């Protein structure tokens, strides 16, 4: 029609999950370019969480002016695109969404499953543009892909305390180290190269950094059901850029946790 943005899907679950996989703060900024939608979660000034879905995944995507941007209840939005479904089947879930000038953001969803089809009509509103927060793309030092499986398994010990990453120096065989520091309990996870399928290591100089684990927490938990890249900067700071390779029915999906503190 005449609108900031319009997007139909045939399978809501592609936006649903990747969206779901950055949902910790109450709201989010979803700047929509003519290329897709990137929605971003900004914690307490040390943690960005990005989430870029490209338009080629939306079965129909259209955008009038290069600015489409806004805030919305991330919680109450995600609640809507799963209005009815913790349990699907061969039956599917569809999303269509229509935004403009600065008043209303509605969503259109139907579900079909063995007898009747069900349209549900949502309209979630838009607050402020808030304080834009932009991190780092300066230089990388060591880069490291790991596996979907093994590294979620490792997160098994719930420590709630502190984080340190490590990346070793040798002619052939490096090492990559996790470590927590809580009430009587230092605990260390480290993965050697054997069986790296897409699990590639670029340890090039020796390096060990520190993270408050209170911020990165939602990241691993909520997002790493899939495999990531660990990249520690040393150009404008020393900081963690986990960006996880997620995907539904075979597509270029990605979200992105930059994180950067020392201690506290």
């Amino acid at each position: 029609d005449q609108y900031s943005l319009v997007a139909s899907l045939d399978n809501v679950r592609n936006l649903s999950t990747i969206l779901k996989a950055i949902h910790f703060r109450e709201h989010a900024t979803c700047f929509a370019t003519k290329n897709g939608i990137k929605v971003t979660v900004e914690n307490a000034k040390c943690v960005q969480a990005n989430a870029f879905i490209q338009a080629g995944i939306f079965q129909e995507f259209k955008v009038q002016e290069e600015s489409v941007t806004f805030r919305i209840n991330l919680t109450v939005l995600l609640d809507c695109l799963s209005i009815f479904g913790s349990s699907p089947m061969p039956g599917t879930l569809t999303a269509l969404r229509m935004c403009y000038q600065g008043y209303g953001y509605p969503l259109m969803l139907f579900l079909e499953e063995g007898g009747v089809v069900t349209v549900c009509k949502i309209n979630t509103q838009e607050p402020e543009e808030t304080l834009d927060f932009d991190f780092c793309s300066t230089n990388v030092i060591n880069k490291i892909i790991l596996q979907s499986e093994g590294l979620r398994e490792a997160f098994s010990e719930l420590d709630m305390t502190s984080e340190v990453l490590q990346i070793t120096m040798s002619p052939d065989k490096p090492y990559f180290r996790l470590s927590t520091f809580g009430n009587a309990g230092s605990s260390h996870l480290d993965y050697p190269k054997d069986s790296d399928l897409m699990e590639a290591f670029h340890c090039n100089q020796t390096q060990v950094n520190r993270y408050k684990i209170s911020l990165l927490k939602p990241s691993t938990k909520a997002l790493v059901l899939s495999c990531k890249v660990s990249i520690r900067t040393d150009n404008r700071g020393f900081l963690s850029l986990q960006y996880m390779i997620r995907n539904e029915d075979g597509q270029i999906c990605f979200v992105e946790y930059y994180c950067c503190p020392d201690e506290e």
């Binding site: 093994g150 590294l151 398994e153 490792a154 098994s156 010990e157 719930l158 009430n183 009587a184 309990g185 230092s186 605990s187 260390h188 996870l189 480290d190 993965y191 050697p192 190269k193 054997d194 069986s195």
Partner: protein, 264 residues
Amino acid sequence: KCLVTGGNVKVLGKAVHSLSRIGDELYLEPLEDGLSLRTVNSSRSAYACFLFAPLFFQQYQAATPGQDLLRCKILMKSFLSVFRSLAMLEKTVEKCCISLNGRSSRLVVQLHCKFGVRKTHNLSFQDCESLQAVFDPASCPHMLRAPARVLGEAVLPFSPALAEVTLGIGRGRRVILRSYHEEEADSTAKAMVTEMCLGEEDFQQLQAQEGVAITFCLKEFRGLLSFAESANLNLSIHFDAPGRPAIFTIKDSLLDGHFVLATL
């Protein structure tokens, strides 16, 4: 040093879990006849030890040298959550080694999982050790031997998952009763009574003493009961009246299990 490998890994995990519902701290005693897993009540009302014969371990060492306190003390929840939240993530086949060290920082438990090894260091500060051998004999005239399975049957009926009072009773005439009670009963005062009662020969061994009851906390009991795997034989040895506790023993090949719960 004490190395548990393969399927045995789960059996101590479940073994430790059982203790983990009897107290909040764990008395890891090594001793040439095995690692002992002792623990007492919050109140010193009821104790619990799990011994494990060196043969179940790949490796075991507690050699005589020294009157150095080789006894490690530890918050049950800081140990259990290491020991419950690990192995159940069984990949193809892993190995565990609790490596106690002589000199400095008390406890080291670490896990091999192909590539990517995890290593928890348990600082057991507050330099202190409780101790004594407590093999309180057949002090009770009443013995009951039962396939652990059958004893579950008895707890299934009245099993809110909250019943502190449970009254094991050898009364009637060779029918074991399991009532429970509270008498307060006015305008809104309340109490619902459940009685499970059991065949004579539904038990391997029932020494009969018509009409003696014993009320023990069914929380603690359930703990040793839950270790009702492999069709273990349960053994209920109790003396009359209150003070004199019940002994819930469990015999096996390398496992020796032992539970003291004080009769109210």
